[PDB]
């Protein structure tokens, strides 16, 4: 029963799946990472049928629900204590993410400050 949002809209995602690179499957030297294919002959790029789909714009996401975590609070990468008080007003629309490389002692310091002033933290219960 944590820190509810200001407003919880229906988040919709036009495609939920990743955009693998052509032949990232056969070859190990290819990372899944998109690289747009500029083959003269290549079937993908001539948007051919039942081939891998190409990442294009209009097949991107709603302005409101853009960038927005399943709960509602978009991240901030909070990185020490002082950076947390930035969200003190913008508490209820978006939350704290505590950076990977903060040391377990201040990883704690930040958390209980957050809860003090009611800012959600997505990894509150992490290093311990």
Partner RNA sequence: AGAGGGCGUGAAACCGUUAAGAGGUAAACGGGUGGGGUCCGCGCAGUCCGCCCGGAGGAUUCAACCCGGCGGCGGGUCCGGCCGUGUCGGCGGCCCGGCGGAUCUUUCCCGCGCGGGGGACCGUCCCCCGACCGGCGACCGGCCGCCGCCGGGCGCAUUUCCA
Partner RNA sequence: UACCCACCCGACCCGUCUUGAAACACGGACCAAGGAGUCUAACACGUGCGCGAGUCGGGGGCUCGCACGAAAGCCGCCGUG
Partner RNA sequence: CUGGAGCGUCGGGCCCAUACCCGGCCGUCGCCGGCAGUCGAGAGUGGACGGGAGCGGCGGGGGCGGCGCGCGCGCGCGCCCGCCCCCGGAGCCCCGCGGACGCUACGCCGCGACGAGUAGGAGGGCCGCUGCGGUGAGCCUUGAAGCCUAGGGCGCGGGCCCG
Task: Give, as ranges, the residues between 79 and 98 that touch other proteins (CB under 8 A).
Answer: 82-83, 85-91, 94, 97
DSSP 88-111: GTTTTTB-BEE-TT--HHHHHHHH
Q: List the single partner that 20 binds among other proteins, RNA, none, CB under 5 to 8 Å by kind.
A: RNA
Q: Report whether 33 contacts 21 (CB < 8 A).
A: yes
Q: Report whether 67 contacts 60 (CB < 8 A).
A: no
Q: Binding pattern to RNA, positions 26-55, x when CB under 7 A? A: xxxxxx-xx--xxxxxxx-x-x-xxxxx-x
Phi, psi for residue 85 in degrees, rounded to 5: -65, -10
Q: List the single partner that 115 binds among RNA, other proteins, none, CB under 5 to 8 Å by kind.
A: other proteins
The count of residues interacting with RNA (CB under 7 A) is 74
Q: List the single partner that 94 binds among other proteins, RNA, none, CB under 5 to 8 Å by kind.
A: other proteins
Report d(CA 95, CA 72) in Å as an integer: 9
- Give the distance, in angstroms, between the CA of residue 119 and the centroid of all CA atoms in the same chain: 18
DSSP letter, residue 117: T
Nearer to RNA, 87 or 102 (CB): 102
Which residues of the shown chain bind other proteins in the complex (CB under 8 A)?
35-36, 38, 40, 67, 74-77, 82-83, 85-91, 94, 97, 115-118
């Amino acid at each position: 029963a944590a820190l509810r949002p200001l407003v919880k809209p229906k988040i919709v995602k036009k495609r939920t799946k990743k955009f693998i690179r052509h032949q990232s499957d056969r070859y190990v030297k290819i990372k899944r990472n998109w690289r747009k294919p500029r083959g003269i002959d290549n079937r993908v790029r001539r948007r051919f049928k039942g081939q891998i789909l190409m990442p294009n714009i209009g097949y991107g996401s709603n302005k409101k629900t853009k960038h927005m975590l399943p709960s509602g609070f978009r991240k901030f990468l909070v990185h020490n204590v002082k950076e947390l008080e930035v969200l003190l007003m913008c508490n209820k629309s978006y939350c704290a993410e505590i950076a990977h490389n903060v040391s377990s002692k201040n990883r704690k310091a930040i958390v209980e400050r957050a809860a003090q002033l009611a800012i959600r933290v997505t990894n509150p219960n992490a290093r311990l």
